[PDB]
Amino acid sequence: SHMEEMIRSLQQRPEPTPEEWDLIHIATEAHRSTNAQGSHWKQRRKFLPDDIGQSDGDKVDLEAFSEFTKIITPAITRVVDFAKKLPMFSELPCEDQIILLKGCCMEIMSLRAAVRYDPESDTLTLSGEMAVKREQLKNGGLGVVSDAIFELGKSLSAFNLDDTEVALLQAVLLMSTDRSGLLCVDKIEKSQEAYLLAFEHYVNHRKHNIPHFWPKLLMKVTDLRMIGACHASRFLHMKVECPTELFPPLFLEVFED
Ligand SMILES: CC(C)c1cc(Oc2c(Cl)cc(-n3nc(N)c(=O)[nH]c3=O)cc2Cl)n[nH]c1=O
Secondary structure, three states, rough: OOHHHHHHHHOOOOOOOHHHHHHHHHHHHHHOOOOOOHHOOOOOOOEEEOOOOOOOOOOOOOHHHHHHHHHHHHHHHHHHHHHHOHHHHHOOOHHHHHHHHHHHHHHHHHHHHHHHEEEEEEEEEEEEEEEEEEEHHHHHOOOOOHHHHHHHHHHOOOOOOOHHHHHHHHHHHHHOOOOOOOOHHHHHHHHHHHHHHHHHHHHHHHHOOOOOOOHHHHHHHHHHHHHHHHHHHHHHHHHHOOOHHHOOHHHHHHHHH
């Protein structure tokens, strides 16, 4: 950290262009509208009871699993609905839309839960409705991914992210070419770079009193990708241990193969 304050004073921190403010407002309203309770979630959230996810070495609590899979079909649907509201997504072929959602769905869901972290109760709130402790989400299926989402939630309290920063982060996660099978690779790659640049410029506009904010927020993309990859491993475990009848059709569609 030699000459850090001057180097910081010397960086170019451009605001968003008129064309970038189009993406930002559209994305922000796509997020807000598909995060319905997002205004009033803290005021009217039901805590999942203390007996539900309580206490071999890695068996799933089916009562807790059942409570999560009851709400998950709307949760997945909120993500699909978010993607549909972005212009560069809806134009894509059907096979690409599927691949992009299969890749990012848990990444987005986890981000949304983590921004609803409450330091007071040590709880995440899921889909604006269901407040859960770490132990409950762990034993209900997620295992170590529970610990990872909570650790992300705690670390994002400092970042004071608004609806726009969350929205653009979701858009960056959605428009990744890291998945196999995509036809329209260039149109997606070009869309991501447009969101990334718009996002950096909005972060410049916000002026957080936090050193290296933008690099630090980019490290959270890696955290979310690790959540997504690790969840794929847990979903196999869930499919082995939990009865099939507890998996909704949309849940199976998004996370199999
Ligand atoms: C245990 C297992 C069945 C499981 C649980 C699980 O829990 C969550 C759920 Cl049901 C929903 C969200 N979520 N989704 C949104 N679209 C949203 O706006 N807000 C939000 O909180 C997040 C999480 Cl972590 N996710 N995947 C899983 O496989």
